[PDB]
Every structure is written in C-alpha cells, then in structure tokens.
Amino acid sequence: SEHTLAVSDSSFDQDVLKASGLVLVDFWAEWCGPCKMIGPALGEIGKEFAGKVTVAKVNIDDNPETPNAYQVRSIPTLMLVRDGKVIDKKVGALPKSQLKAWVESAQ
C-alpha cells in the first residue's frame, strides 16, 4: 500500500508524534494545486519504503491547530518527523526524485 493516513488535529499526537519509524507530514488543502501535483509522488514514496515511512496528510482547512503549531506559512509544506521531533521541512512542490532523496537522507 501507499502507507498514507488522513490525520486530524486530535489524532496527530498518536499518529505522528507517537509513530514508529519516519513520518512525512503533508500539509495540504483542496485549493492547493501544488499539493495535488505532489500527491502521487508522496504515495509512491509511501509504497516504495514499504512501511518504513508513513505519509501523514493533514488537511489545513479542517485542522487549523497543527499547522499553527508548526508555523506553516504556506502550502505545500512537508515535514520529516521521527521520535516526535521535526528533522526538516520543505516548502513548495518538488519532483519525485528530489522528494525521495530527501526522505532517504533522514537515514
């Protein structure tokens, strides 16, 4: 599967901060073209890592608390999270190979 979860403000702690492995948080909304453009690539990353990466989609229209907590200033914003801590963030769309390399770089 693509290891992609719809996460809410109420489930973020369990689903992301208390996740095992590496989490790729995807802050998105239906009005965001670039977000939709990178969606297939994100799912492909989830498939390719075979459960070692969880893609946690956070719709920012429905879930205002989490993007506020993480100082999301525009979308797309992606975050790599492990052990409840942010490793890095990216703003804006990127090609699949660059997204994959970024995930790999977390080790």
PDB file of C-alpha atoms in Angstrom:
ATOM      1  CA  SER A   1       0.000   0.000   0.000  1.00  0.00           C
ATOM      2  CA  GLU A   2       0.921   3.673  -0.041  1.00  0.00           C
ATOM      3  CA  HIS A   3       1.121   3.972   3.773  1.00  0.00           C
ATOM      4  CA  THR A   4      -0.840   7.211   3.629  1.00  0.00           C
ATOM      5  CA  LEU A   5      -3.006   8.314   6.524  1.00  0.00           C
ATOM      6  CA  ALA A   6      -5.544  11.110   6.949  1.00  0.00           C
ATOM      7  CA  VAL A   7      -4.557  12.676  10.269  1.00  0.00           C
ATOM      8  CA  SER A   8      -6.530  15.226  12.282  1.00  0.00           C
ATOM      9  CA  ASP A   9      -5.579  17.748  14.969  1.00  0.00           C
ATOM     10  CA  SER A  10      -6.956  15.276  17.544  1.00  0.00           C
ATOM     11  CA  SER A  11      -5.036  12.255  16.202  1.00  0.00           C
ATOM     12  CA  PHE A  12      -1.767  13.961  15.367  1.00  0.00           C
ATOM     13  CA  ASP A  13      -0.133  13.073  18.682  1.00  0.00           C
ATOM     14  CA  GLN A  14      -0.875   9.377  18.305  1.00  0.00           C
ATOM     15  CA  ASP A  15      -0.459   9.093  14.556  1.00  0.00           C
ATOM     16  CA  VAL A  16       2.634  11.278  14.065  1.00  0.00           C
ATOM     17  CA  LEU A  17       4.353  12.081  17.372  1.00  0.00           C
ATOM     18  CA  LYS A  18       3.959   8.505  18.699  1.00  0.00           C
ATOM     19  CA  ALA A  19       4.550   6.852  15.362  1.00  0.00           C
ATOM     20  CA  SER A  20       7.307   4.269  14.849  1.00  0.00           C
ATOM     21  CA  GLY A  21       9.647   4.860  12.006  1.00  0.00           C
ATOM     22  CA  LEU A  22       9.875   8.019   9.868  1.00  0.00           C
ATOM     23  CA  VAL A  23       6.824  10.212   9.222  1.00  0.00           C
ATOM     24  CA  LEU A  24       6.393  12.513   6.221  1.00  0.00           C
ATOM     25  CA  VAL A  25       3.770  15.087   7.219  1.00  0.00           C
ATOM     26  CA  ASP A  26       1.955  16.653   4.242  1.00  0.00           C
ATOM     27  CA  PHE A  27       0.049  19.861   4.997  1.00  0.00           C
ATOM     28  CA  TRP A  28      -2.443  20.292   2.161  1.00  0.00           C
ATOM     29  CA  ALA A  29      -5.826  21.662   1.129  1.00  0.00           C
ATOM     30  CA  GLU A  30      -8.215  21.178  -1.797  1.00  0.00           C
ATOM     31  CA  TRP A  31      -7.465  24.727  -3.102  1.00  0.00           C
ATOM     32  CA  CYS A  32      -3.774  23.989  -3.375  1.00  0.00           C
ATOM     33  CA  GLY A  33      -2.739  22.941  -6.873  1.00  0.00           C
ATOM     34  CA  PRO A  34       0.875  22.125  -6.000  1.00  0.00           C
ATOM     35  CA  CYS A  35      -0.313  19.928  -3.153  1.00  0.00           C
ATOM     36  CA  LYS A  36      -2.375  17.881  -5.535  1.00  0.00           C
ATOM     37  CA  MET A  37       0.541  17.758  -8.007  1.00  0.00           C
ATOM     38  CA  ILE A  38       2.870  16.114  -5.468  1.00  0.00           C
ATOM     39  CA  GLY A  39       0.217  13.716  -4.105  1.00  0.00           C
ATOM     40  CA  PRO A  40       1.013  10.852  -6.459  1.00  0.00           C
ATOM     41  CA  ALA A  41       4.722  11.163  -5.690  1.00  0.00           C
ATOM     42  CA  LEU A  42       4.064  11.059  -1.968  1.00  0.00           C
ATOM     43  CA  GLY A  43       2.007   7.909  -2.315  1.00  0.00           C
ATOM     44  CA  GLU A  44       4.711   6.378  -4.434  1.00  0.00           C
ATOM     45  CA  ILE A  45       7.241   7.162  -1.679  1.00  0.00           C
ATOM     46  CA  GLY A  46       4.975   5.509   0.834  1.00  0.00           C
ATOM     47  CA  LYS A  47       4.779   2.405  -1.360  1.00  0.00           C
ATOM     48  CA  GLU A  48       8.496   2.343  -2.084  1.00  0.00           C
ATOM     49  CA  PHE A  49       9.524   2.449   1.600  1.00  0.00           C
ATOM     50  CA  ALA A  50       7.152  -0.499   2.339  1.00  0.00           C
ATOM     51  CA  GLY A  51       6.022   0.740   5.737  1.00  0.00           C
ATOM     52  CA  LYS A  52       9.235   2.325   6.936  1.00  0.00           C
ATOM     53  CA  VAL A  53       7.698   5.754   6.103  1.00  0.00           C
ATOM     54  CA  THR A  54       4.201   6.867   6.992  1.00  0.00           C
ATOM     55  CA  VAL A  55       2.731   9.730   4.930  1.00  0.00           C
ATOM     56  CA  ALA A  56       0.525  11.730   7.302  1.00  0.00           C
ATOM     57  CA  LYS A  57      -1.802  14.029   5.356  1.00  0.00           C
ATOM     58  CA  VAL A  58      -3.091  16.970   7.377  1.00  0.00           C
ATOM     59  CA  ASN A  59      -5.819  18.978   5.649  1.00  0.00           C
ATOM     60  CA  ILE A  60      -5.239  22.508   6.937  1.00  0.00           C
ATOM     61  CA  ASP A  61      -8.811  23.693   6.297  1.00  0.00           C
ATOM     62  CA  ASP A  62     -10.194  21.031   8.639  1.00  0.00           C
ATOM     63  CA  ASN A  63      -7.224  21.043  11.088  1.00  0.00           C
ATOM     64  CA  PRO A  64      -6.020  24.534  11.987  1.00  0.00           C
ATOM     65  CA  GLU A  65      -4.204  23.682  15.224  1.00  0.00           C
ATOM     66  CA  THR A  66      -1.395  21.539  13.823  1.00  0.00           C
ATOM     67  CA  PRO A  67      -0.215  23.893  11.021  1.00  0.00           C
ATOM     68  CA  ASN A  68      -0.331  26.743  13.559  1.00  0.00           C
ATOM     69  CA  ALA A  69       1.848  24.746  15.993  1.00  0.00           C
ATOM     70  CA  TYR A  70       4.427  24.086  13.274  1.00  0.00           C
ATOM     71  CA  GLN A  71       4.408  27.666  11.899  1.00  0.00           C
ATOM     72  CA  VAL A  72       3.118  26.606   8.481  1.00  0.00           C
ATOM     73  CA  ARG A  73       3.221  29.848   6.431  1.00  0.00           C
ATOM     74  CA  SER A  74       2.111  28.438   3.054  1.00  0.00           C
ATOM     75  CA  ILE A  75       1.365  25.072   1.498  1.00  0.00           C
ATOM     76  CA  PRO A  76       2.615  22.652   0.359  1.00  0.00           C
ATOM     77  CA  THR A  77       4.672  22.232   3.489  1.00  0.00           C
ATOM     78  CA  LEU A  78       6.212  18.860   4.152  1.00  0.00           C
ATOM     79  CA  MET A  79       7.934  17.785   7.375  1.00  0.00           C
ATOM     80  CA  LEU A  80      10.073  14.780   8.253  1.00  0.00           C
ATOM     81  CA  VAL A  81       9.353  13.679  11.840  1.00  0.00           C
ATOM     82  CA  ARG A  82      10.881  10.875  13.914  1.00  0.00           C
ATOM     83  CA  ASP A  83      10.535  10.203  17.642  1.00  0.00           C
ATOM     84  CA  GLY A  84       8.154  13.086  17.942  1.00  0.00           C
ATOM     85  CA  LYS A  85      10.735  15.639  16.622  1.00  0.00           C
ATOM     86  CA  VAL A  86      10.928  17.530  13.370  1.00  0.00           C
ATOM     87  CA  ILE A  87      14.029  16.620  11.372  1.00  0.00           C
ATOM     88  CA  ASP A  88      13.458  19.017   8.484  1.00  0.00           C
ATOM     89  CA  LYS A  89      10.790  20.881   6.488  1.00  0.00           C
ATOM     90  CA  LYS A  90      10.287  21.650   2.798  1.00  0.00           C
ATOM     91  CA  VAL A  91       8.053  24.361   1.320  1.00  0.00           C
ATOM     92  CA  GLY A  92       6.733  24.097  -2.204  1.00  0.00           C
ATOM     93  CA  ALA A  93       6.414  21.282  -4.702  1.00  0.00           C
ATOM     94  CA  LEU A  94       9.474  19.257  -5.755  1.00  0.00           C
ATOM     95  CA  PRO A  95       9.975  16.411  -8.272  1.00  0.00           C
ATOM     96  CA  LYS A  96       9.620  12.852  -7.131  1.00  0.00           C
ATOM     97  CA  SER A  97      13.353  12.093  -7.246  1.00  0.00           C
ATOM     98  CA  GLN A  98      14.162  15.021  -5.048  1.00  0.00           C
ATOM     99  CA  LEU A  99      11.421  14.118  -2.570  1.00  0.00           C
ATOM    100  CA  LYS A 100      12.688  10.553  -2.447  1.00  0.00           C
ATOM    101  CA  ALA A 101      16.292  11.703  -1.913  1.00  0.00           C
ATOM    102  CA  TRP A 102      15.161  13.960   0.936  1.00  0.00           C
ATOM    103  CA  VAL A 103      13.409  11.062   2.674  1.00  0.00           C
ATOM    104  CA  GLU A 104      16.429   8.830   2.171  1.00  0.00           C
ATOM    105  CA  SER A 105      18.707  11.431   3.633  1.00  0.00           C
ATOM    106  CA  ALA A 106      16.988  11.055   7.001  1.00  0.00           C
ATOM    107  CA  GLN A 107      18.540   7.523   7.078  1.00  0.00           C
TER     108      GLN A 107
END
